[PDB]
């Protein structure tokens, strides 16, 4: 702010002001609020809580069976070298 003498800035907005209204009042709000609809315990989703496999491992079962059977052919006898 600058004040300049001799033209000085009025020393106030004075008493000639026009009170325009008495509408100043905010009427307090008084209220009762009830949000009470029956609630049912459940919601349907496509899927909740699953941690789906991105790849599975290979998996398997097992079997064996049979017996011990055989047809054989042997090497001929040979002269013994030494000993």
């Amino acid at each position: 702010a600058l004040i300049n003498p001799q033209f000085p800035y009025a020393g106030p907005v004075p008493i000639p002001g026009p009170a325009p209204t008495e509408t100043m009042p905010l009427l307090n709000y008084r209220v009762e609020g009830r949000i009470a609809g029956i609630q049912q315990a459940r919601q349907f989703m496509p899927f909740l809580q699953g941690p789906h496999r991105a790849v599975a491992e290979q998996t398997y079962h097992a079997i064996g069976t049979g017996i011990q059977m055989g047809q054989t052919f042997n090497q001929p006898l040979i002269n013994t070298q030494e000993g």
Binding site: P46, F47, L48, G50, A54
Partner: protein
């Protein structure tokens, strides 16, 4: 804001139920996506 991401909520699919189907009809699908580089 909420990208389609299977593994977050099972398999998801884009669906079209056609009223009329001419010979050689097909759906050309275009996707915009983010992915993971393992």
């Amino acid at each position: 804001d909420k990208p389609i991401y299977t593994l977050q909520y099972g398999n998801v699919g884009f669906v079209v139920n056609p009223k009329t189907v001419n010979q050689n009809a097909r759906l050309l699908m275009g996707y915009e996506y983010f992915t993971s580089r393992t």
